[PDB]
Design a binder for this molecule. Structure first.
Ligand SMILES: Nc1ncnc2c1ncn2[C@@H]1O[C@H](COP(=O)(O)OP(=O)(O)NP(=O)(O)O)[C@@H](O)[C@H]1O
Ligand SMILES: Nc1ncnc2c1ncn2[C@@H]1O[C@H](COP(=O)(O)OP(=O)(O)NP(=O)(O)O)[C@@H](O)[C@H]1O
Ligand SMILES: Nc1ncnc2c1ncn2[C@@H]1O[C@H](COP(=O)(O)OP(=O)(O)O)[C@@H](O)[C@H]1O
Ligand SMILES: [Mg+2]
Ligand SMILES: [Mg+2]
Ligand SMILES: [Mg+2]
Lengths: 466, 492, 467
């Protein structure tokens, strides 16, 4: 079918049809352009007109211009031939390596797996990260989320995890760059090449890359997630072997939606967000999941605007995770890295019948001392420690030592910490924390605990401090 | 003369988007009536305008297009109802989602029906035992009562609901039909895997048999999420209207409101305070008023509601949180501070209430916890007022000593809802000062030991307390004997 | 005249009349319904179309449906045969006891008494509640207001007042439940009966009931208060023997308006309220008043959204009252019931020339000490108590005691306190405080003062506490 461009406002192009009106979600191709310009149908305005969202810049478009009904929604190459490649929202290569020659194609819009399709197995996923493993352990085939205000550690954490987990996976991985920095895509790509995850020689790559960065128009940013998403779906259902899915940053998708929402002509909701915020997030999040057919371990970065965790975007996100790593600027400013808030991060796995009672007891142990310290803080703030009870002073010491012992150098952050990255084994963590709690180190100085791996190193650091 | 598509019982889509269809025709539709789309997709007639009908779509609007034929149904929205539903997982419309076959429903019910008036009810008087000491002792819940579970994300709101559903096996596996409690659990905006998790646990506990689970999850259309609570409600009234007893959990009304706000804004109804429709209050009042206790003239049945609300930054004074607090018969407020501190459940005694009072407690429990609430309040104060041992008398030292001991007793793990007599026995011990000399750190351990003793040895005292439902003079004597002696041996 | 329904959107229904447009406020009856559905005319849109507010559910209504102009605003059965009965927004019995056979009917809408109709008598109305009486005494025939956020005791207090006052009345009483809990209406009804205030067998009924609960559509809620008020005005004027008016909760009237306001096409005022908030309140509050013909003693419960006393609604209400009892969650949270805020409650009769200097000096004395203590609170909190002058550490004492002596176990809250309700007489109150202020109990412990009636009980409790 051939419609005509009736109106243009930013990424919202209205196209009129005479004989066949394309259904909602269909991808149209604008005629008379140097490069592909797909328009995704959003709604039927009536009058044989359809309101659509452009998948690329709309400059140059002219009223009256011809539009062609592709006859289907945005479809993209899916299969193993995507592994090691970089692709668009619309599935075109962007790595300058020729066409992605796949047998099948898949449309970005799909329904979420049904209820009967759900899975309930809960296995812990050890990361080697002290705070994570001890207080808010991830879980195989689970949903993980890394909350963080600007420049707090979301990305670094995603890298360290790709490093500590992705690298020794044995299965596939999909990295979806959503609304983030292009340089980052480039940084990862080349790095991936270097470590051999991406092989431009053989067919041995284990990662497929999808990107729709900070330079794309809203519509692109609003769909790349779906794109990356689809790629992963294929490996999950169509092949049966466990996938890994990294997204940086999923907040960008929601932001993108708000960018076009006014244009779509909707009465804004709270904070100027689109009234469809929750549903939008929902029909999308619901596809990022493990099922009886396959497993999807997903780590998503979630940017928090103005550092406000009550912002509708992040706020509505919590409900979709199985484990949440909330990063804090306050902690980061203290020099603690990763800047994870130990009293704000949670995990469904934190259950004695899953991590064991030793693990469950240390964890709650650490939290209770940190909570206690937190309450003392107001007073410490005006009057310092002097007026503190001998008993109280001991919680403060311990807390400040536990607080420090929670930090740790990442390989990925070596350039900044000035220390060699460390990977602590779960039992190592449970232990080192027990002792601290148990007053087995009330003699060592705080500093000894800062930036170290296993407790053993914290003892040594103490000697070196003399 | 093909007369099947006259504009009186049919209509044609003028435009569609964001789940809102603007149907032309439908000259005879009634407000709130269900229509049908060519695609078998159901809608709901919300705005009857001069030149068009604003239809709310119960599904993916992707299947709808301008021009589609819309057909009346002549029916105001309704759903399956009755015992067939027990042990099954349905969607916001009644359809099964557990892939366990069709529901054997013989009855139906309108989702939106006014709650029974003044005349058809009777004061709440029968307890609704949660199995949680803190709740059952301080913020008692009676049948036909509405008690709100409110707090921040992850404070343990759902858990309160699960323990309560699980605790019901006692009576359900029993003989007496009056004591039985059929449960309904409505998920709203929640996540499919979580719900799947949720129904697993229930199954593992052998609680699904008596539970219905209406699920309207994260990916479900706004209208489904929106309807969900009313649907589940109607299912519960079936029991209520038939001299049976039901318990309904609306987890949570926060996500429903959002759904409402969405559905509403998309219909172009001007946004109100905080962007919500001016009638959000009404959205919840209407619903929760349905939970009720019917008089013997109406079957003596009931409907008890436990709605969930999610605050932000522990702020209960917030508009929605206050809107809902002003409807229900009290609230259970959970704080994360309390939780991290080791107080689990994270119930905030001060801020929580039960507008039913002791009328919803057994005499045994009223006996032990009659004044405890105000006591604990007064304790929290002085506890504060002396965060500097300001030349403290005796009466206050005693106050502090009880306060702390009592607080430890109120603690409680998960999944182990206690029996009423068990509660009484343990509260008894503290309330009577028998523990005033034990070390606070010991209290938890003691309770486990003690409770072991009485359960195993003394089930004669337990069954009497439970049976008589009161604490007779001798029972009160046999008990004093037991605690004091056991305590002594215990502090060896 | 007969109009047709042209549009339906929630509680608002537009009607098109071919001939003769029903005036604003007129009540129309929807044709073809199992139940009576009244539409109150709200506006004249033009084009022979009126915008209305439904007094009930709008489900099933159909475009084109028939509507008859009743030719008059909502009129309800008013008179003595209302006593002992339960009424609707539209004057329909809802107690299943058959018709209400009144001689006359009255329109719920009506002008407020003229300026020259006002009264100025001011007699204290003793309640038996320590706090109220001491600090913010009610006045016979005056306007009383009970302010509070969710679950602070607005209702309970209203309950104790019915008990300690309504019961020994000797005149009529009207209780209008506006947008409150249905459960409550049932509790109250059955209580009135069990206490003979309501008599189902004879004509001894001393109280008429009117209900428009939370399970109603905004339209009903925007009107029940009028219905209830209308009943009450009758006993004031037509008969005149002194009436007690109870409304719970008047906020609901305001929130009802706000709920349909957007559908009426209005730019919202601050805090989402309708722009006509104040005036709406005015033309209503103005009828709730004592006149030369009769006397009304109105006790209205007033909801405080989000606990913010500055909220346009609670804020706008203050002016209409003569006495105000402010309840506080902060106080409540402490276990102090009634949760009245001693420094935020007021009464027009708190005048030496009216209650006398003893009452006056005590009250003020009690207030000064609490204020004094409030000031210190935050300070000792951090800096401790040592550095405090013995002079100052005695007010800390006394204040803490008074703070307690202000509490009281209500008769209506036994299920709550686990204590037998106490009713203290005015002189027992003034005296007890007088003494505490006078240093006459610096020996007893605070706790002794908590949850007791008269000072003697505090002394007794001390001993009992002595061990
Ligand atoms: N684990 C870490 N150890 C040490 N320094 C770190 C760590 N994580 C982050 N930083 C420092 O903080 C900077 C920002 O980290 P990064 O992970 O890029 O934050 P981000 O949340 O991804 N920021 P943005 O995406 O801009 O909001 C890094 O370049 C480091 O200088
Ligand atoms: N009594 C208890 N003792 C110990 N842990 C508990 C208790 N009750 C709940 N929990 C745990 O506390 C956490 C919070 O429980 P949950 O009931 O999900 O809170 P919530 O407010 O529903 N969270 P969310 O639904 O994510 O906002 C879970 O990990 C529970 O296992
Ligand atoms: N005077 C009182 N004495 C003891 N408890 C009270 C008192 N007033 C209120 N409470 C507690 O507060 C709860 C809420 O009171 P209520 O009158 O329902 O508040 P409101 O009507 O102001 O929302 C009661 O159910 C009871 O538990
Ligand atoms: Mg980043
Ligand atoms: Mg929950
Ligand atoms: Mg009330």
């Amino acid at each position: 079918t051939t419609g005509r461009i009736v109106a243009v406002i930013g990424a919202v192009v209205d196209v009129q049809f005479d004989e066949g009106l394309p259904p909602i979600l269909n991808a149209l191709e604008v005629q008379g352009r140097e490069t592909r310009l797909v328009l995704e149908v959003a709604q039927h305005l009536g009058e044989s007109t359809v309101r659509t969202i452009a998948m690329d810049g709309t400059e140059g478009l002219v009223r009256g211009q011809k539009v062609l009904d592709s006859g289907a929604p945005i479809r993209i190459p899916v299969g193993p031939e995507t592994l090691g490649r970089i692709m668009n929202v619309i599935g075109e290569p962007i790595d300058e390596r020729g066409p992605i020659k796949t047998k099948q194609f898949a449309a970005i819009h799909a329904e979420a797996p049904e209820f009967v399709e759900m899975s309930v197995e809960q296995e812990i996923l050890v990361t080697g990260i002290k705070v994570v493993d001890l207080l808010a352990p991830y879980a195989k085939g689970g949903k993980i989320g890394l909350f963080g205000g600007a420049g707090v550690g979301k990305t670094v954490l995603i890298m360290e995890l790709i490093n500590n987990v992705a690298k020794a996976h044995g299965g596939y991985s999909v990295f979806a760059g959503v609304g983030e920095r292009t340089r980052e895509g480039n940084d990862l790509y080349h790095e991936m090449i270097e470590s051999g995850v991406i092989n431009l020689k053989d067919a041995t790559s284990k990662v497929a890359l999808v990107y729709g960065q900070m330079n794309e128009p809203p519509g692109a940013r609003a769909r790349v997630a779906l794109t990356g998403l689809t790629v992963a779906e294929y490996f999950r259902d169509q092949e049966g072997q466990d996938v890994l899915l990294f997204i940086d940053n999923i907040f960008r998708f929601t932001q993108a939606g708000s960018e076009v929402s006014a244009l779509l002509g909707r009465i804004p909701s709270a904070v100027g967000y689109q009234p469809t915020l929750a549903t939008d997030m929902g029909t999308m999040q619901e596809r990022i999941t493990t099922t009886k057919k396959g497993s999807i371990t997903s780590v998503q970065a979630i940017y928090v605007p103005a550092d406000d965790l009550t912002d509708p975007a992040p706020a509505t996100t919590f409900a979709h995770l199985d484990a949440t790593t909330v990063l804090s600027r306050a902690i980061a400013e203290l020099g603690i890295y990763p800047a994870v808030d130990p009293l704000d991060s949670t995990s469904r796995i934190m259950d004695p019948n899953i991590v064991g009672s030793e693990h469950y007891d240390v964890a709650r142990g650490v939290q209770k001392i940190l909570q206690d310290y937190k309450s003392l803080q107001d007073i410490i703030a005006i009057l310092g420690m002097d007026e503190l009870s001998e008993e109280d002073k001991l919680t403060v010491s311990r807390a400040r030592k536990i607080q420090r012992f929670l930090s740790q150098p990442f390989q990925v952050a070596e350039v900044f910490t000035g220390h060699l990255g460390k990977l602590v084994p779960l039992k190592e963590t449970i232990k080192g924390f027990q002792q601290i709690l148990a007053g087995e180190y009330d003699h060592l100085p705080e500093q000894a605990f800062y930036m170290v791996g296993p407790i053993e190193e914290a003892v040594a650091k103490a000697d070196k401090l003399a | 003369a093909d007369t099947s598509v006259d504009l009186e019982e049919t209509g044609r889509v003028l435009s569609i988007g964001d789940g809102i269809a603007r149907v032309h025709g439908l000259r005879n539709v009634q407000a709130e009536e269900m229509v049908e789309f060519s695609s078998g997709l159901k809608g709901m007639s919300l705005n009857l305008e001069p030149d068009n009908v604003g239809v709310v779509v119960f599904g993916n609007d992707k299947l709808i297009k301008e021009g589609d034929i819309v057909k009346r149904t002549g029916a105001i929205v309704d759903v399956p109802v009755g015992e067939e539903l027990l042990g099954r997982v349905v969607d916001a419309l009644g359809n099964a989602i557990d892939g366990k076959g069709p529901i054997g429903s013989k009855a139906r019910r309108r989702v939106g029906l006014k709650a029974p008036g003044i005349i058809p009810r009777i004061s709440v008087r029968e307890p609704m035992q949660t199995g949680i000491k803190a709740v059952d002792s301080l913020v008692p819940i009676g049948r036909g009562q509405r008690e709100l579970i409110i707090g921040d994300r992850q404070t343990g709101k759902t858990s309160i609901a699960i323990d309560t559903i699980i605790n019901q096996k006692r009576f359900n596996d029993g003989t007496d039909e009056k004591k039985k409690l059929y449960c309904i659990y409505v998920a709203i905006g929640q996540k499919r895997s979580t719900v799947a998790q949720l129904v697993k646990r229930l199954t593992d506990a052998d609680a699904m048999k008596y539970t219905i689970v209406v699920s309207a999850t994260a990916s479900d259309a706004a209208p489904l999420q929106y309807l969900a609570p009313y649907s589940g409600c109607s299912m519960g009234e079936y029991f209520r209207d038939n001299g049976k007893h039901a318990l309904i959990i609306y987890d949570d009304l926060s996500k429903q409101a959002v759904a409402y706000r969405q559905m509403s804004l998309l219909l172009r109804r001007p946004p109100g305070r905080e962007a919500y429709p001016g009638d959000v209050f009404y959205l919840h009042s209407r619903l929760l008023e349905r939970a009720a206790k019917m008089n013997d003239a109406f079957g003596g049945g009931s409907l008890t509601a436990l709605p969930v609300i999610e605050t932000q930054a522990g702020d209960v004074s917030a508009y929605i949180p206050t809107n809902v607090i002003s409807i229900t018969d009290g609230q259970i407020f959970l704080e994360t501070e309390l939780f991290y501190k080791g107080i689990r459940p994270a119930i905030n005694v001060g801020l929580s209430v039960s507008r039913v009072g002791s009328a919803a407690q057994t005499r045994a429990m009223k006996q032990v916890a009659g004044t405890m609430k105000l006591e604990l309040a007064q304790y929290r104060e002085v506890a504060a007022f002396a965060q500097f041992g300001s030349d403290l008398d005796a009466a206050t030292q005693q106050l502090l000593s009880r306060g702390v001991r009592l607080t430890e007793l109120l603690k409680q793990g998960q999944y182990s809802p206690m029996a009423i007599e068990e509660q009484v026995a343990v509260i008894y011990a503290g309330v009577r000062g028998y523990l005033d000399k034990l070390e606070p750190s010991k209290i938890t351990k003691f309770e486990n030991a003690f409770l072991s003793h009485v359960i195993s040895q003394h089930q004669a005292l337990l069954g009497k307390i439970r049976t008589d439902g009161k604490i007779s003079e001798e029972s009160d004597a046999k008990l004093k004997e037991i605690v004091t002696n056991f305590l002594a041996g215990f502090e060896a």
